[PDB]
């Protein structure tokens, strides 16, 4: 995508200080769309559901970049967790390929 | 109607008239004293105060009257 975290932080801080009504950044949208693409690809092929970190960028004040998360609870079984880990690893590897 | 679990408290007038306490000869003075005490006590701050300060203010008013 050709952008860094510091540039995004400076752009957001400048936009907040200038009090501009319209706050739209393209590379952030592309990154969010890509991560949602991994999520959807993992959902359609295999019956495993994960989610990404949902944030509002225009309200934050400290630096932050989009990410992904996986949760677990105390009612699961080890074999299913291992199978899900393998499935999500395969999904990530397949989506990140074709460079 | 239907009964409930409420205990109704009778009013002062009903209790007095059913108790036979009302006596014309020796109750008018009591009522006058009650009125004089309550009127004096309510309209002036004694009821949010402390015992020492309330007694001090009572003595102050009593001395003011006596002088």
């Amino acid at each position: 995508f050709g952008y860094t975290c510091e540039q995004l932080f400076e752009t957001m801080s400048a936009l907040q200080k200038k009090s501009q009504t319209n706050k739209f950044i393209e590379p952030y949208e592309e990154e969010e769309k890509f991560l949602q693409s991994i999520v959807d690809h993992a959902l359609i092929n295999y019956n495993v559901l994960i989610t990404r970190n949902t944030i509002v960028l225009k309200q934050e004040t400290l630096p932050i970049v989009p990410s992904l998360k996986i949760c677990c609870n105390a009612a699961m079984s080890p074999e299913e967790l291992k199978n899900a880990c393998e499935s999500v690893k395969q999904s990530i590897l397949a989506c990140c390929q074709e460079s | 109607q239907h009964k409930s679990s409420m205990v109704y408290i009778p009013t002062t007038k009903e209790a007095k008239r059913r108790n036979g306490k009302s006596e014309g000869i020796l109750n008018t003075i009591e009522e006058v004293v009650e009125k004089l005490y309550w009127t004096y006590y309510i309209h002036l701050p004694f009821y949010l105060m402390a015992s020492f300060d309330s007694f001090f203010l009572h003595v102050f008013f009593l001395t003011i009257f006596s002088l």
Binding site: T51, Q59 | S5, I9, T11, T12, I42
Partner: protein, 554 residues
């Protein structure tokens, strides 16, 4: 030294049902309100007491303020070891300094027994209170584990939906059986179910807007709503008697704030004109936008806002309108739609409508209604939706049941009886109190009837004497109110009946005669003559005459 846990009482069904909701006596005790059709709202009129009452109030407060400082100074100067909370131990400041806690310690402390009272069971028309004994001066309490019933005129259940046996309770239990009590998380990743969307559409249709949103808490709703679309370059014009949540939300938003006097529209128009002309501070550039915040019904005063004038002004000067109505969304109106129904104003004129379910529907939460193209943006721009927990299932079931009951779908003729009962009760109580000789505020239909007590030392006496008669009331005072005017706020409910009101009228008449609380002038009666009616005549003649809409000054 600890609050005991009270064992539930075992009683037959009929007795408990009567305790929760009271059966009607006669069908002549109902009243159906009528629309206004847009006729102008007259300026309110307020009555005043004589001078000597105010003079005595001033002397009382002056003496209290002097003595408080005398004690504070002497105690802080000499007896240091006793007061270790207000002194620094080892290079650490105290949690709070003495000055900001002066009012709480010096005058409020002597009255702490009339403010917080533990209760148990469902709050209906009879509430069970725990018995407690005071030690020292309201420093700590000792409990003997004894309970006794009282009549409640202090709880927010206007339509009487707080019950333990009914269709709403059945729906809540069924929802608990079907959906568990646990939620998933924020309503952007997991935690949204079909019940949420059903409640959304039901509320949107009930209000009359096009789309809506539902939140788990009302205070958070107001505190987080404003920062999504307001900025430093905008202006907010609001009344002087708004709720704390609006103030917190506006503070977090960061915009400029101008305030106008209560009930004045000439001043409002002048302020709008001046603010439009002047512009931004120190630069005199035009504002980006202007927003008007108001309240549907004010609980401390029991008065309505003149909506048509606000709509006219916002149409003429191109401004936006925000209306807060939590006390008037279910208890007021010919059919209970809100403030937009009595005045005949089309709902599309107002921009944002907000309300809470706590007061009338018996469940906790809040909502917001607006147009589709606004809700679509707000569902993305809000911080409550993607960062905070979601609403549970039983509360949603209770709210849906209450709304379908009021709308007239699930049960044919239950809501209308409740509306008529609450209207009649409010009118009868207000008229009887005014004919006795007291002073009340209101607009002849609000469920809030504030009776004014002026001397500082009369509120605790009134509270304790009403408690001895087995009646529960709530009294407010400084600074929540103007210094001179203290009051007791009555909250009328549909569950109470007429005989309860007669009992209350007799007891309050006796207590007021004892405490010298009835001081009325000719500005409160329509004939211009001060009226002191005897009690039995009031009871005989008021319920018939309370229906005619000419006996009320405002």
């Amino acid at each position: 030294t600890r609050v005991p846990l009270c064992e539930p009482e075992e009683l037959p069904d009929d007795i408990q049902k009567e305790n929760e909701y009271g059966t009607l006596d006669s069908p002549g005790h109902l009243y159906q309100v009528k629309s206004r059709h847009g006729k102008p709202l007259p300026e309110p009129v307020v009555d005043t007491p004589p001078y000597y009452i105010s003079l005595l109030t001033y002397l009382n407060y002056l003496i209290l303020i002097i003595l408080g400082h005398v004690h504070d100074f002497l105690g802080m100067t000499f007896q240091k070891n006793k007061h270790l909370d207000l002194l620094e131990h080892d290079g650490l400041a105290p949690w709070f300094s003495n000055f900001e806690s002066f009012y709480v310690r010096r005058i409020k402390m002597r009255i702490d027994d009339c403010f917080s009272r533990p209760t148990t069971g469902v709050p209906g028309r009879f509430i069970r209170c725990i018995d407690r004994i005071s030690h020292n001066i309201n420093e700590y309490f000792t409990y003997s584990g004894a309970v006794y019933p009282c009549m409640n005129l202090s709880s927010y259940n206007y339509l009487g939906f707080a019950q333990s046996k009914g269709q709403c309770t059945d729906a809540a239990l069924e929802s608990v059986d079907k959906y568990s009590i646990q939620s998933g998380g924020p309503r952007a990743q997991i935690g949204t179910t079909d019940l949420h969307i059903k409640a959304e559409k039901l509320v949107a249709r009930f209000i009359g807007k096009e789309d809506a949103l539902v939140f788990s808490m009302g205070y958070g709703t107001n505190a987080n709503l404003f920062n999504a679309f307001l900025d430093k370059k905008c202006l907010v014009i609001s009344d002087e008697l708004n709720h704390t949540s609006i103030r917190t939300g506006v503070r977090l938003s960061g915009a400029a704030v101008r305030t106008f006097k209560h009930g004045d529209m000439v001043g409002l128009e002048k302020l709008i004109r001046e603010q439009i002309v002047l512009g931004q501070p120190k630069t005199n550039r035009p504002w980006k936008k202007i927003l008007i915040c108001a309240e549907g019904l004010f609980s401390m005063e029991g008065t309505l806002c003149n909506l048509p004038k606000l709509v006219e002004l916002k149409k003429k000067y191109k401004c936006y309108l925000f209306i807060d109505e939590a006390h008037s969304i279910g208890a007021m109106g010919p059919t209970g739609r809100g403030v937009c129904e009595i005045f005949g104003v089309d709902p599309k004129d107002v921009d944002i409508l907000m309300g809470t379910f706590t007061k009338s529907f018996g469940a906790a939460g809040g909502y917001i209604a607006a147009d589709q193209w606004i809700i679509d943006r707000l569902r993305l721009d809000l911080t409550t939706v993607s960062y905070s927990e979601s609403m549970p299932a039983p509360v949603l079931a209770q709210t849906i049941s209450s709304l379908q009951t009021i709308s007239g779908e699930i049960c044919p003729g239950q809501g209308t009886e409740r509306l008529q009962r609450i209207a009649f009760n409010s009118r009868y109580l207000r008229l009887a109190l005014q004919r006795l000789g007291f002073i009340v505020y209101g607009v002849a239909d609000s469920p809030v009837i504030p009776l004014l007590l002026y001397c500082p030392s009369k509120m605790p006496a009134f509270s304790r004497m009403m408690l001895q008669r087995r009646i529960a009331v709530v009294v407010v005072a400084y600074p929540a109110t103007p210094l001179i005017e203290s009051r007791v706020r009555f909250c009328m409910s549909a569950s109470l009946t007429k005989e309860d009101i007669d009992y209350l009228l007799r007891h309050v008449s006796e207590v007021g005669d004892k405490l010298n609380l009835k001081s009325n002038s000719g500005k409160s009666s329509y004939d211009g003559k001060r009226q002191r009616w005897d009690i039995e005549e009031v009871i005989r003649r008021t319920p018939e005459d309370c229906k005619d809409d000419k006996y009320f000054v405002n």
